[PDB]
From a paper:
The Fe-protein mediates ATP-dependent electron transfer (ET) through its [4Fe:4S] cluster to the intermediate [8Fe:7S] P-cluster in the MoFe-protein; the electrons are subsequently shuttled to a [7Fe:1Mo:9S:1C]-R-homocitrate metallocluster, the FeMo-cofactor, within the active site of the MoFe-protein. The active site FeMo-cofactor contains a [7Fe:1Mo:9S:1C] metallocluster coordinated with an R-homocitrate (HCA) molecule.
To compare relevant reference states, we pursued cryoEM structures of nitrogenase in solution by preparing an anaerobic workflow for the generation of single-particle cryoEM samples within a glove box. Comparisons of datasets with varying dose, exposure to oxygen, grid types, and conditions were used to benchmark this procedure.
Residue numbers in the entry:
A (entry chain A), B (entry chain C): 4 to 480
C (entry chain D), D (entry chain B): 2 to 523
Amino acid sequence: MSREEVESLIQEVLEVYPEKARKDRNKHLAVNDPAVTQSKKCIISNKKSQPGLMTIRGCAYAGSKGVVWGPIKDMIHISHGPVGCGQYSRAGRRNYYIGTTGVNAFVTMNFTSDFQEKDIVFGGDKKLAKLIDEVETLFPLNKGISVQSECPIGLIGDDIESVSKVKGAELSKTIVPVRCEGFRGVSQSLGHHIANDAVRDWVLGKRDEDTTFASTPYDVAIIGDYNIGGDAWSSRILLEEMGLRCVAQWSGDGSISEIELTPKVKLNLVHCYRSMNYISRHMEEKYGIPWMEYNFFGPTKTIESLRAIAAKFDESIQKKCEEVIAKYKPEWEAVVAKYRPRLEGKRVMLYIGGLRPRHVIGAYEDLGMEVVGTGYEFAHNDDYDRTMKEMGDSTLLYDDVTGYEFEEFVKRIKPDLIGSGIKEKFIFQKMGIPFREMHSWDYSGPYHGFDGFAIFARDMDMTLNNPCWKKLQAPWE
Amino acid sequence: MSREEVESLIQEVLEVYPEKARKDRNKHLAVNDPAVTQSKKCIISNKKSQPGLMTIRGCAYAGSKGVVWGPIKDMIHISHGPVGCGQYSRAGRRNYYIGTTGVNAFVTMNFTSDFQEKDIVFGGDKKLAKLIDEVETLFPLNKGISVQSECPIGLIGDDIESVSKVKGAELSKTIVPVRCEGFRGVSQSLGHHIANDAVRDWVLGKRDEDTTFASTPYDVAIIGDYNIGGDAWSSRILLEEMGLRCVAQWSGDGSISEIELTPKVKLNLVHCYRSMNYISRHMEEKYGIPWMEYNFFGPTKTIESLRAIAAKFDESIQKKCEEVIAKYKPEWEAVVAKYRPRLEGKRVMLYIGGLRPRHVIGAYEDLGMEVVGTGYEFAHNDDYDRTMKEMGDSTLLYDDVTGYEFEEFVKRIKPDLIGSGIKEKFIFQKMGIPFREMHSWDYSGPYHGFDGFAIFARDMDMTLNNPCWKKLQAPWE
Amino acid sequence: SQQVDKIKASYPLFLDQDYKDMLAKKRDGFEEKYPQDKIDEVFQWTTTKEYQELNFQREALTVNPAKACQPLGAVLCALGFEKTMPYVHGSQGCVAYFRSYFNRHFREPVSCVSDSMTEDAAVFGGQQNMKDGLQNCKATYKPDMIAVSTTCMAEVIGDDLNAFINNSKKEGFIPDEFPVPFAHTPSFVGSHVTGWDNMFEGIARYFTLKSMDDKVVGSNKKINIVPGFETYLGNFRVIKRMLSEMGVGYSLLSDPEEVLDTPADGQFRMYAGGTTQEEMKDAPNALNTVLLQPWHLEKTKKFVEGTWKHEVPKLNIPMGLDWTDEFLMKVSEISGQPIPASLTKERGRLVDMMTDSHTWLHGKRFALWGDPDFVMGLVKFLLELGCEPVHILCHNGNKRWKKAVDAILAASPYGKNATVYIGKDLWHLRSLVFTDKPDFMIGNSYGKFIQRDTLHKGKEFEVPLIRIGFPIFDRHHLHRSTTLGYEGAMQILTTLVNSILERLDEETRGMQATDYNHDLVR
Amino acid sequence: SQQVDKIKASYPLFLDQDYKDMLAKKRDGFEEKYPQDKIDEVFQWTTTKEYQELNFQREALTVNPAKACQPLGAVLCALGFEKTMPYVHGSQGCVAYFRSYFNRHFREPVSCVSDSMTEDAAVFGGQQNMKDGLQNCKATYKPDMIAVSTTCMAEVIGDDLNAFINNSKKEGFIPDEFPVPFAHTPSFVGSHVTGWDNMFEGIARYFTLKSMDDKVVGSNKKINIVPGFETYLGNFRVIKRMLSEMGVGYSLLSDPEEVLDTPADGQFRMYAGGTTQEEMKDAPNALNTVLLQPWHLEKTKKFVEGTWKHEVPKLNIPMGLDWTDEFLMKVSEISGQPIPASLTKERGRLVDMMTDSHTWLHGKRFALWGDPDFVMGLVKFLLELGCEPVHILCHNGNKRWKKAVDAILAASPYGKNATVYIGKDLWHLRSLVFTDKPDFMIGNSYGKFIQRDTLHKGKEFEVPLIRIGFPIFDRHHLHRSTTLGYEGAMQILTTLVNSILERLDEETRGMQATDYNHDLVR
Ligand code: ICS
Ligand code: CLF
Ligand code: CLF
Ligand SMILES: [Fe+3]
Ligand SMILES: [Fe+3]
């Protein structure tokens, strides 16, 4: 579809809006130029959603509690405030972990102060202290407490920092106050940044003066992988088969001790740049550890990223990388042989959060599958600069797409497949367009690594070519 | 209610019959007099059912395959003929056993020759031989084969005795042909007798010259207990706690080796006189073993029967019996204290097959719960002579009761509870009268012994006093 | 022993230590049991492919069949009619077994009488049995009609049903105008479904054969629906509801729905609802007759086409999406009524459920068994759902039905690994689910033992049973379910996807071992 | 690694030996995990009664709450109306979570907008957000009405919904005649059901309070039905069906049934069905208003009684037999219509199912939780079935409701061992089901983890979960079920008895150990 056709599409979708909404949303829609290396000249991002347009973005609490802090298994994360946020976010994200739930791991539990009217009017600080005492009494094997603020906490003047500090000194336990109230920022991304600052300020530096950890020149940390359906495990297996030592995981299946051990690694492998590039930059500054972005989506991307990571170490690591690539080549080659003919040359539109909009194009193209449109819920301009190169020519780019905008784009482009969240799945399934949840892998996965790519191809084939899509129109209509 | 009222009841119910049916069924209805010790002057039994009157009786195959031979676990029982009877009788009766089904025990499996048109036209003897060969190939751990004839087997002139003998000689295995075709006799009772003769003629006399079994003067054999829901086990526990050794069980949880060991016991404890009094009499004649009838339904009856059984042995057995009665007295006393007030003085009508019509009256009265009517599906006159002494004065007695007769009797008498089979349960539940299946214990039990009596009282309380019976009438009617 | 506060039934009472020791003493002293290692070895052997070969070489032995005899279906069909007493000419034990079988499946009274033929009749016939039984049944239970089938005894001795009933009427045992249809239902031919077919064809021939002169096709502007052997009341109900929604006048012939679901309101109703004699008399005046289960309604099909002159449409069982669509379109074309918006909406919601659940349903392998029309409808819906029916078994199916289902499987890429077996029993299927393990079984209650056997090999080899079909004895009130139409497809889809989900939940319930995949959201 | 023929998802992929070693090395090298014996001892301690006492001493900590916040119920209620856009004034993350929650439960699109208030609005207010959001929503999604609720942010900062909407209308952001009902739904008061109550009362006040002059009670000869927070589509459907059979004119107010079950027919409908504005305008002219869930419809009850002048009947939720009977009799006397033979037959059939299944149901002990009306209906039905509700939990229930349910338990001898807990969460219930073990749990999907924990203690301590309520995330299409009326009672009874039978089948599946009680017939 030609670039002029895409521009006409954008205008013929935008004309519905009132003038202010039209001019605002015009900056968030673009036709991709793979010859341009700047975003500010082509698209605008990280901006407030237009009111009443059914934005898909979440809040800072979702980006901090649900995303960064939540996966850390051996900590107890208190959703501080009314019952709703913790209840809706309880076990909504498949950040997988190993543990004994309620005993030594607490990822899928909903700890909350369950704010009532008296808590709103009088404050929840002493309630927070009593809650911490009850947490220690009833969950003595927890290795730290995080307090994720919901909107009333920031709006009523609650001093959770003082409570955290005092109860931590009294209990000799790490208590991390996270000011991730949902009104802060414009989306989950500021949640990423605030959670990163919380990790840096309350947890990261606790082993700075400790040298008891036996460090090796093959020490790496995984940064910004949340083990969605086991994604972090499928990446760590390849990292360690290359001879490297993965000291820490951030933060899927991650423990607090691993976070405290991260400053001792030799290389930070940042998967989700959007969520943990802040902590990676801080680690590079204060501790001197270099970090590099990496991509384990699909065979070509994981081979390139494995070779890049091995190039940062000595020759033994490079030889191990070549051995790993040789041993995994038949597996993904057989996956491609099985699934490429069924998906070859099929157009996809993607609307995911901050990293997976890009960073998964290669996985699609490794199956001979073109991406014609893509978009970000909460990305910044750096995300779009990295997006332009991966996107093909004359493709659609949407930032903070509205429900109507997504509807119209899919209506005209008519993609073979859509990848987005749960709030678009049933909408687009009702139109007869096969849908893949690219947040939760549709309760499947992992998708990272070679095993994850095999799963990715199988799921794409199962949903794209499902018989159910040849049935939506009744034969008598 | 007076005897004359019951007499007028009987006449009124009989009025709707044609004259021949009326005069036939008049002989099968009586008003009980416990003083009379004869039945031929009061009632007639063991007679053909009137055609078209919805008799509850079964066939000889049911009384032989389903009743006597079926429970024997390590044997393979072939329902010889069309698929129907074996399919309907497969696992219909809860004759419990211990074994590995399909490997060393085959009670709940349907082995059948699956007669087709060609089998009816040409015969099934060759099919039976090939089936036996396939049985040995596919179930090598079976310890014998029985062949239960269905109606066409005796109708088409099949010679299953010759096949059984020849394949037994060739395979060195006991193969028992049982001519239990459903048309023989009038009910299941002739099935009892034919199965008894099969046991006597093909199995019983195989260890006659075998003296290798170490016999003791405390040897008893349970005869006519089919372990319904574990009834035989609950009786055997009391038998062995009294110091006796139970060598065989007939035939619930019964192995064929137990049957072959029965002629070595000192006392035969015949529970169901109806089904195995024949084999008990033959054992007394040929082997000299005396038998006695016994009753383990309810605490009074089991105490009396335990004392009677211990009276047939030395003083150590009597002392053990007294100790058993002393240890079990608190259990049934507590059961009575819990359940008597909610069942005291409640009238029961019973219609069970041939031993449980009587022989459970004591269990009902031990909870202070009277029986006003009783009846037999297939009993003989000796059963009624044993019934009159136990039934109360001026009670109703019915032999081979018809569906209409039972309906009318329950309609006028209005019993508090009914005990009968599955073909009456829903009929009487729809009239709002609580129903207890007294064939299968309503998939509960056991009811034998003290543990069985506890279960009996619990079940009677749960069904009699259930809230559901105060709800059949809509409040607006 | 027993505690009055917590009384134990057989389980777990017999797990007590004293009972355990008693049973061990019984086993060691007198049972002469095979050693446990030999038992384990033999079981492991029965799980193998060589044992599967020996199993499938069976020619005379049937183990755990998946079918019943004809008079059972005849009794069900007869119960379909108004104030009709099923009357089986033969021995009483058969009637006792039919009544108990249907009592256990439906949990309702089943009224059926026998003439109680005995050894005396075996050489003299059941003629006097017929006269006395007919007279007694009419005088006692007052039916408006008596539908006569046969047990294998009467079939073997050669009892002339027509002559016996005629002589009963001549001698005055039964009025000459009292309707007594008859059908020979030999238990050694076919299965219960062909007994249903025979009974229905006999009743239709009784009520229509002699009065075809005044019959004009379509003159009553109705469509006849013959449901066949059906044990889901929801299927009768859904067919009637769908035809009522379309505004199509219909006559449901052999409708036992009312008599098998009578209210418990203080009285017992031996008769309730059912197809009236007038409806059967007027049936040849319908526009057309639709057979819901054509693969066991052959005789009815020939009678309806040849005598009523009805051009019976070639329709598959209305199961799944495509076949229900074909049923509705054919009904619309025959009756002239358009398909209403409600049925189109129902179709769309079924499709929505398919889209919602396809990921969990995709690729799941199934072993299944039952009656032919039900089995093929299940296979078609499974293929529509993206599932892979690996083992399809119909013990009473034939080669024509096998060719039809093979053609159905060949039209979808999800039938490539499928195999169809006819004439095989549940022991064959036990071998199949051991050697080529499916994810689940769909079948009747007899499958539970198979699930037992697989579990004995190990939890990782267990094949859970999904209870769809007849008979269902170990669950309550499943006979009220629906399997036909969009509603039945929705019920089947829900059952299947939630069975998959509960199996996955069980497999991922072990904490710190497999509970990483114990997702709240699925 | 992976094999292309059998690709493994996370389970059982991570059970591979290499993944096992990787995870063990991760745990030992860097996780600094507590020793397994310490973990086992702590868990065993959490199963004790001393831990139960400490757990029930909780005053500030809530673990695994069984409730949500008000705007969720407000969104559901708003979805009940025709072409109505739910519009939550506040922060967008709340709307994302509400939409995700309802998407997961219903497996359907959930349309809801936010004015996306941010830190700028935290001090200034949401006035500009209100104006722009109303204008954009109307211009983009073209609703016929916008129903406005609030997130806790707007409630805390004190946004005046009425003034904001009025000022938006005055300045042309939205037409003056465009219906914009509003309700304050604070997330820190009550629960989601309170939000449903508030939203419905706000809509009713918007459409009726100013037009009461020409209203005559009973002039339209109809009965108003307010269903409350309801997440079973079958409940709306069964209420409509029962009133239709009775011949009773009715108006279902806040009917989300159509929009939550839209067909997948190639197009997406953001709106479908729902209560029309004319219906709500004419509602004061009804004979009476019946509240299906009175215990969370207090505000609606006061508005209906005080303004519509309807004498709202004191009716329990129409669950079970007695309460459904009371509902039908009250409807009959209010409308003057007699109860039809079909509903009496349905009642008799439910009673027949009770008689059929009472033996397996009798004495069974239950722990259960959910919303107050649903929980109390479940308790009433359980007492009607002879079951023993041992643990009754309502996280959002109150002391009046507790007194009512205690009174109901005192009437039956099966409530003697019962205890009712209000304000308690699923961790309290975990302690309860450990220390005083029931046979089963009835509740939403969050109960699965409890079943996990019990299984960790041992198979003999496992308490299986029966999924009835909201939300149900780990099963598909259970939201289509019914719980009210005779039909809902039949569904609940079938679920309960078949759960009991499935558990017993599992317990007796071990060959040669417990399979002596693996009965074919139950
Ligand atoms: S064998 Fe007989 S009908 Fe004596 S055929 Fe029948 S398990 Fe009955 S009254 Mo079912 S003569 Fe046993 C009997 Fe009694 S099957 Fe059971 S309960 S004590
Ligand atoms: S009285 Fe008894 S149960 Fe009847 S047949 Fe005869 S042995 Fe058997 Fe069998 S296959 Fe069916 S059920 Fe019969 S018609 Fe024949
Ligand atoms: S934007 Fe985010 S999810 Fe929203 S509240 Fe704010 S932190 Fe939370 Fe919470 S209880 Fe309910 S869901 Fe809200 S209205 Fe408050
Ligand atoms: Fe859907
Ligand atoms: Fe019933």
